Write a protein that binds this ligand. Structure first.
Ligand SMILES: *[C@@H]1O[C@H](CO)[C@@H](O)[C@H](O)[C@H]1NC(C)=O
Lengths: 49, 49
């Protein structure tokens, strides 16, 4: 079986090599800057760390 | 005391690793307050006058 006609077929693909880098502040996100919240956060402590 | 203090206490050591780090944010102070949604009525003194 031998071909006689042909075409240059294109083929697209994608590779997700790099998810979007994110960083987050602990006390600002969880705590919203009200002083009793920061007083109530210091016991948990190193969770933010 | 400062950002480096928070970075040191995040790593629980006097020595850390060189690099880029995310310290807790800060907020611009509110400039004041606005109270305008509902106003009352005035007392009547016309029968007095
Ligand atoms: C080959 O394929 C192309 C595109 O489908 C067409 O125009 C052409 O006539 C074909 N030739 C033969 C010999 O089949």
């Amino acid at each position: 079986s031998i071909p006689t006609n042909f075409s240059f077929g294109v083929t697209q693909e994608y590779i997700q090599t790099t998810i979007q880098k994110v960083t987050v502040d602990c006390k600002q996100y969880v705590c919203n800057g009200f002083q009793k919240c920061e007083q109530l956060l210091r016991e948990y402590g190193q969770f933010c760390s | 005391f400062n950002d480096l203090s928070q970075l040191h206490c995040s790593y629980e050591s006097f020595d850390v690793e060189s690099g880029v780090y995310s310290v807790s944010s800060f907020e611009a102070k509110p400039s004041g307050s606005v109270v305008e949604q509902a106003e009352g009525v005035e007392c009547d003194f016309s029968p007095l006058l």
